[PDB]
Amino acid sequence: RIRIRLKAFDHRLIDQATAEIVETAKRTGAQVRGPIPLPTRKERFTVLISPHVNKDARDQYEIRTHLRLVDIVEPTEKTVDALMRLDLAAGVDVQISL
Amino acid sequence: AKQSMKAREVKRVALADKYFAKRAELKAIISDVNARWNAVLKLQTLPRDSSPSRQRNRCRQTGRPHGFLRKFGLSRIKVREAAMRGEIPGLKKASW
Amino acid sequence: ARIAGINIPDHKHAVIALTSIYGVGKTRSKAILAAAGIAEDVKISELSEGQIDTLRDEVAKFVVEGDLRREISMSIKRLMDLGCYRGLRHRRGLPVRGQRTKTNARTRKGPRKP
Amino acid sequence: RSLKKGPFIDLHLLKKVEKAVESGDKKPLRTWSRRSTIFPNMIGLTIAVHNGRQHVPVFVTDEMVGHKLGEFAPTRTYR
Amino acid sequence: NQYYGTGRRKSSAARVFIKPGNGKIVINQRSLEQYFGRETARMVVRQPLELVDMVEKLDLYITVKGGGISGQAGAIRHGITRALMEYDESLRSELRKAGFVTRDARQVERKKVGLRKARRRPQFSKR
Amino acid sequence: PRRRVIGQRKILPDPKFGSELLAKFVNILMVDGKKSTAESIVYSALETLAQRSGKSELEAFEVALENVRPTVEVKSRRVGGSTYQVPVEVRPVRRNALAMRWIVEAARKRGDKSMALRLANELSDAAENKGTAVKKREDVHRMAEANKAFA
Amino acid sequence: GQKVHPNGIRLGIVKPWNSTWFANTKEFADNLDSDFKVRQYLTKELAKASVSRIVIERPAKSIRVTIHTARPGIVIGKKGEDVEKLRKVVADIAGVPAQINIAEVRKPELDAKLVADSITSQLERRVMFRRAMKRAVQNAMRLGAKGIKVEVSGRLGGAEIARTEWYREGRVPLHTLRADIDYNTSEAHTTYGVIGVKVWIFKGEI
RNA sequence: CCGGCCGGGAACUCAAAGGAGACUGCCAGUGAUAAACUGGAGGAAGGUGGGGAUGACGUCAAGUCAUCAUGGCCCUUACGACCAGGGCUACACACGUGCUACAAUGGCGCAUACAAAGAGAAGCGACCUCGCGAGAGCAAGCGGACCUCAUAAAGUGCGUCGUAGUCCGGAUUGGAGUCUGCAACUCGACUCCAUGAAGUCGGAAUCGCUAGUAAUCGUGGAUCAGAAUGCCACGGUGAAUAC
């Protein structure tokens, strides 16, 4: 009943990471819940596009922090011993809750 | 290049880091009523440059005090330039 | 009937009458009626003399009209005796709280004079 | 208008006031602080308040009880 | 056992579950009159039911969320129309003739830069 | 406006009477999106008008709208001397649109207490021919008959 | 003046981000500051080596930096000692352990940043700028794809009337989001002023 | 245990990835047998469905040397720096952009069901306690579908005010204060009490808007120690008219 929560900027990277996570959980076979679609947080910024003066001209930027949680509920000894070093992705933020 | 301005800013950051957070959290606790004094005549002796209100959030690329953003720590022009260069991760140009 | 005024406050409600008296607004009028025991929805017209007497005592136990007006007057006079910033803005006819005089000072300035 | 839990007195203003009441009557000295709170116990000083290019003397009297020292010094010049 | 219709009206989403039963309906654990029957735009949830004219034939149960009162009413109406889609296709043709099948693609517009509102430009003088 | 025609936008009829014309009257009397307030005012004024009249409300309301609506509209086309007023056949949409607009404008001009009472007085004066909107209609009609040129 | 930055509009689908790591806000600001310091010192040190791109990945107590370079031998130096040394000073300036990575870029005169740097170096050498653009477009057509556009602006012969010259053959569709147009700019300092060079070029068929 | 209670496929809103879908596709008429135009069936949207980004060659020697960089000139024992005060907030006036209202479509007291978009650790901070108040402690929860900001308001039911310079509006002024920050006189926001200017829908002239638009009503964010009637952004009700 532990939950693994994952944050990323690239949804393709986080989906491939959680796909390898569920593939390593299911490569032998276990009762494992898939990743949940926890909502993406959007940081939006409107800043001025000219150095001196603007009236209508501003540029608009957005950061989408995509959020997943896989919630491993089934204990498997090989999964616990080797659920590290699977994705090898440097853009993925990992947290553990219970 | 406002290096005088930036040196003033980093000097007051260093002085505020030296004279803050050693007794600053106890200021309200000593001053406030627990549910004049020698303690409050000592408390009204603190200097003026040690406060964090002395600081201004300036850019770190340029030192420009206007147009600042806390998340990037940069002025608006250099936020735009780094976003268009790709040096800021995840800052795709919004289009909704 | 009437207590200390130029025009009849009757044929109206008691809170409206005690706002038409000088120096008491709506909230202090409701406080006066609450301490006097007089309901708000009744009219001050066709009110009995004893209830009017209790209202008179309620008005008299706080600061009356005229006395608070001269109290404001000697407060402004004391500021002018100070000669401070508030007294100088009172003499010049300029705002005292600190708002702008480049535009929109027309309440303190009165009508616009070229 | 300020907080009723503590008045604001400068320490340098307080030591000037204490030295002035130690000495007694004294010719005015130039003080640069306009951020001050006065009291009826220390009404009687002839301390002078600085406002820019000109320095003006201030003789405090009995009726001021909580006013700033900068209120009596006009910072701006009008015709 | 159940006949279901969602319906959406630009900020409101509903879920309509119908058993064949008594004609009294309920919306968010209270009746139509207790929810917005005192309010305006009450007849739109009766329009698909009164166009075909059944009253006591079916038993409705609707949970609606999001939006305002008329958005919720339009979502409830459109969930009733998807329930009639689940019912039959001749009545789908009748509701398409009436104008209730289509989900309303009129959403609110975004606020744009250099403008006070979505389309309202700020006033500028001649000079 | 220039390439092709863009028609007026389709409205829901009112719940109490089921009339697209009365719902359009509600939408014309409407200000600031207050549809419930506008239709409550319309329902109260129609109830007051029915109470004062007592005859057939449909026949009386068509007589009132016929007494208010213009049969000849005024139009300046800026052709000869930049001021002409030609008589032309008018759409029924323009007829009842001008009728509700003039009725609502005369209701705003009337100086009673409640706007339901203003609208009730205007709809009674439409029937007994004493209306400000009616007088506006004969202003339009006598202007058209005075300045009619191609007939 | 009125053009969008094409890399900044292609970042969503076609151009990868130059930094791909993740951080929350209170270290996001510090990571941008350290990223600029690392990139600025690395560009200053390897401007002689004529590098193309600097890509930073961080696991939040480590940094791993990949430099796309025309000549990997100049950067790796002599038996890895020089590259180990600037890895050490990058670790010292970032406060975290550092890994170095070298990615060779093929066709250096088809690489976008190197064309701008070469035209900048040629204007520092004070050869004719018109010949610099013709050599750039000729060599790009000779050993690569079929679209490139060069703009050279500012103090072109010291004329009073301002004039921007741009040379044109091939296709550079900038409004198309699918095509991979690499664009870069550079500044050349001379005794008569600074000259700005901006190059657009696509690489491959889709 | 009336607080969405717990085994449950997760039915279903929802979130978030992979996709399907809408491409004049199909049929009639028009067009020259062409492109194309009009109408109709099906369908969630039909004719770049809606909106946004995307703004060619060039013009205005248009704007920024005050974001930064740079050619020339200048000070470089002063056109440099450190300070304490003040000014950038002045005020016989003139113009531009907005906010509040001139009222009954409304004002005051009570009850009443929802929103969407967000942000939060040198923070968000429910709740305990007192006060007709801004609001004062070691109070839990959260670094975020959980916890907080956060009671949504116009609206709907009433009671009242009955067309008045008024139970309309709040300017200005005087008392008693909170929060922030070493310190609100110049020079922050508020609420506790008191007064209640002008304002009776505004001349010549002029501006925005074609549908979820205009109007109107709330809400969040950026910078921010504290201070938006501005800016960005989101939702509620939601027109009239284009011959």
DSSP secondary structure letters along A40-62: EEEEEEEEESSSS--SS-EEEEE
User: Which of G60, G80, G106 finishes a domain?
Assistant: G106
The Cβ of residue A21 has, within 10 Å, a number of other Cβ atoms equal to: 22
Q: Contact B79/B43 with Cβ under 8 angstroms?
A: no
| Max Cα-Cα span within chain D | 41
Do G204 and G122 belong to one domain? Answer: yes
Do G112 and G173 belong to one domain? Answer: yes
Q: Find all residues with CB under 8 Å of G11, minimum gap 6, and list them.
A: B86, B92, B93, G17
**Cα(G111)–Cα(G202) distance, integer angstroms:** 10
Helix (H) or strand (E) holding G47: none
CATH number for the domain including G69? 3.30.300.20
Chain Cα centroid distance, residue D35: 8
| Bridge pairing between strands D54-56 and D48-51 | antiparallel
Q: Contact G172/G148 with Cβ under 8 angstroms?
A: yes
* Given resolution (angstroms): 3.0
Q: Contact G105/G139 with Cβ under 8 angstroms?
A: no
Do G71 and G91 belong to one domain? Answer: yes
DSSP H helices, F8-149, are 20-29, 35-53, 57-68, 92-109, 115-127, 132-147
Q: Is E63 helix (H, G, I), strand (E, B) or coil?
A: strand
Do G26 and G84 belong to one domain? Answer: yes
Do G98 and G127 belong to one domain? Answer: no
Angle in degrees, 0-180, between the axes of helices F132-147 and F92-109, rounded to the nearest 10? 130
**Cα(B8)–Cα(B3) distance, integer angstroms:** 8
C88 in contact with D at a CB cutoff of 8 Å? yes
| Bridge pairing between strands G165-170 and G147-153 | antiparallel
Q: Contact F52/F124 with Cβ under 8 angstroms?
A: yes
Show the tokens assigned to G112.
């976008």
**Cα(G158)–Cα(A62) distance, integer angstroms:** 43
Indicate if CB(F28) is under 7 A from strand H: yes
**Cα(B89)–Cα(B95) distance, integer angstroms:** 17
Do G170 and G76 belong to one domain? Answer: no
- CB contact under 8 Å between A8 and G58, yes or no, is no
C93 in contact with D at a CB cutoff of 8 Å? no
Show the tokens assigned to F91.
């759409």
Instruction: Report CA-CA distances (Å) from D15 to D18, D41, D65, F129.
Output: 5, 15, 20, 91
Do G203 and G129 belong to one domain? Answer: yes
In terms of Cβ atoms closer than 10 Å to its own Cβ (0-12, 13-18, 19+), residue B80 is buried
Q: How far is A40 from chain B (nearest CA, A)?
A: 13
Angle in degrees, 0-180, between the axes of helices E69-87 and E90-98, rounded to the nearest 10? 150
Nearest CB to A8; choose among G22, G57, G64: G22
Do G36 and G102 belong to one domain? Answer: yes
**Cα(E101)–Cα(E94) distance, integer angstroms:** 9
User: Which of G106, G129, G161 finishes a domain?
Assistant: G106
**Cα(F64)–Cα(F56) distance, integer angstroms:** 12
Do G117 and G200 belong to one domain? Answer: yes
**Cα(A62)–Cα(B95) distance, integer angstroms:** 9
Please, which residues bridge with residue A4 across strands? A96
The Cβ of residue G93 has, within 10 Å, a number of other Cβ atoms equal to: 15
Do G120 and G183 belong to one domain? Answer: yes
Q: Contact B85/B96 with Cβ under 8 angstroms?
A: no
CA atoms within 13 A of residue F125's CA, in its CB half-sphere: 18
Q: Contact A21/A69 with Cβ under 8 angstroms?
A: no
Amino acid at F56: S
Do G141 and G74 belong to one domain? Answer: no
Q: Nearest 5°: phi and psi at F42? A: -65, -45
Q: Contact B30/B23 with Cβ under 8 angstroms?
A: no
Do G31 and G50 belong to one domain? Answer: yes
**For chain B, after which residues does the C atom lie more than 2.5 Å from the next written residue's N, i.e. where is it broken?**
35
Containing domain of residue A81, as a range?
A: 1-98
C1' nearest to CA of G1: which nucleotide?
H55
Containing domain of residue G174, as a range?
A: 107-206
In terms of Cβ atoms closer than 10 Å to its own Cβ (0-12, 13-18, 19+), residue B88 is buried
What's C53's DSSP letter? Answer: H
In terms of Cβ atoms closer than 10 Å to its own Cβ (0-12, 13-18, 19+), residue G191 is exposed
Contacts of G30 in chain B (CB under 8 A): 73
Instruction: List, in sequence order, every beta strand (DSSP E) within chain G.
Output: 51-57, 63-69, 98-104, 147-153, 165-170, 181-190, 193-202
**Cα(A60)–Cα(B94) distance, integer angstroms:** 5
Show the tokens assigned to B21.
């957070």
Q: Find all residues with CB under 8 Å of F65, minimum gap 6, and list them.
A: F96, F99, F126
| Bridge pairing between strands B92-93 and G51-57 | unpaired
Indicate if CB(F10) is under 7 A from strand H: no
Angle in degrees, 0-180, between the axes of helices F115-127 and F35-53, rounded to the nearest 10? 40
Q: Contact E87/E16 with Cβ under 8 angstroms?
A: no
Distance G194 CA to H69 C1' (A): 9
**Cα(D47)–Cα(D21) distance, integer angstroms:** 12
Indicate if CB(A42) is under 7 A from strand H: yes
Does some domain include residue G194? Answer: yes
**Cα(A2)–Cα(A33) distance, integer angstroms:** 11
B48 in contact with G at a CB cutoff of 8 Å? no
C-alpha closest to that of E101 among E89, E112, E110: E89
Domain count, chain G: 2
What's B28's DSSP letter? Answer: H
CATH number for the domain including G177? 3.30.1140.32
Domain count, chain A: 1
Using the structure block, give the residue that is written with the tokens 């957005």: A62
Q: Contact A63/B90 with Cβ under 8 angstroms?
A: yes
A45 in contact with B at a CB cutoff of 8 Å? yes
Q: How far is B27 from chain D (nearest CA, A)?
A: 13
**Cα(D35)–Cα(G137) distance, integer angstroms:** 70
Kindly list the partner chains of chain E, i.e. chains with 3 or more CB atom pairs below 8 Å: A, F
Show the tokens assigned to G196.
């700005």
- CB contact under 8 Å between D71 and C78, yes or no, is no
| Bridge pairing between strands D54-56 and G147-153 | unpaired
**Cα(G196)–Cα(G186) distance, integer angstroms:** 6
Q: Find all residues with CB under 8 Å of E60, minimum gap 6, and list them.
A: E16, E17, E18, E25, E26, E80
The Cβ of residue F126 has, within 10 Å, a number of other Cβ atoms equal to: 28
What's A66's DSSP letter? Answer: E
Using the structure block, give the residue that is written with the tokens 């109406």: E77
Show the tokens assigned to G142.
């000779």
Residues (83-142, chain F) with CB within 7 Å of strand H atoms: 91, 93-94, 97, 101, 108, 111, 113-116
**Cα(C111)–Cα(A80) distance, integer angstroms:** 84
User: Which of G106, G121, G152 finishes a domain?
Assistant: G106
Does some domain include residue G84? Answer: yes
Kindly list the partner chains of chain G, i.e. chains with 3 or more CB atom pairs below 8 Å: A, B
Instruction: List, in sequence order, every beta strand (DSSP E) within chain E.
Output: 3-5, 13-19, 59-65
**Cα(B61)–Cα(F55) distance, integer angstroms:** 83
Does some domain include residue G3? Answer: no
CA-nearest residue to E116 within chain A is: A56
Distance F14 CA to H169 C1' (A): 36
CATH number for the domain including A94? 3.30.70.600
Q: Find all residues with CB under 8 Å of F37, minimum gap 6, and list them.
A: none
B43-52 burial string, b = 16+ CB within 10 Å, else e? beeeeeeeee
Amino acid at E80: I
Q: Is G51 helix (H, G, I), strand (E, B) or coil?
A: strand
